[PDB]
Amino acid sequence: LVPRGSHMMSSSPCDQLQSFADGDLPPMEAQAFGQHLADCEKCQVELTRLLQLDQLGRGYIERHGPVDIPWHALPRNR
Numbered sequence: 001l002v003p004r005g006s007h008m009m010s011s012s013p014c015d016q017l018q019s020f021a022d023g024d025l026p027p028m029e030a031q032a033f034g035q036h037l038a039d040c041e042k043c044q045v046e047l048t049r050l051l052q053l054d055q056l057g058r059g060y061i062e063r064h065g066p067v068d069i070p071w072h073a074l075p076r077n078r
């Protein structure tokens with residue numbers, strides 16, 4: 001149940017990674033395009049294009065990258 005507004009267009013998961021690297025993609029869609037984010041030269045070319053201007057910036061680094069998820073999330077839905 002939603003109003004009518006700007007009609008979106010068709011797009012491919014090789015291009016959707018653009019929103020992923022910019023930091024503007026939701027966690028549900030991040031798994032859905034993730035299957036195509038597998039080993040693909042056309043994907044890596046689109047990703048590295050963004051790193052060429054977003055990774056460019058000495059002083060910004062990381063040294064602790066832990067991977068942990070909350071238990072209350074993923075509710076009993078179908």
Ligand SMILES: [Zn+2]
Pocket residue numbers: 013014036037040042043
């Ligand atoms: Zn691809």
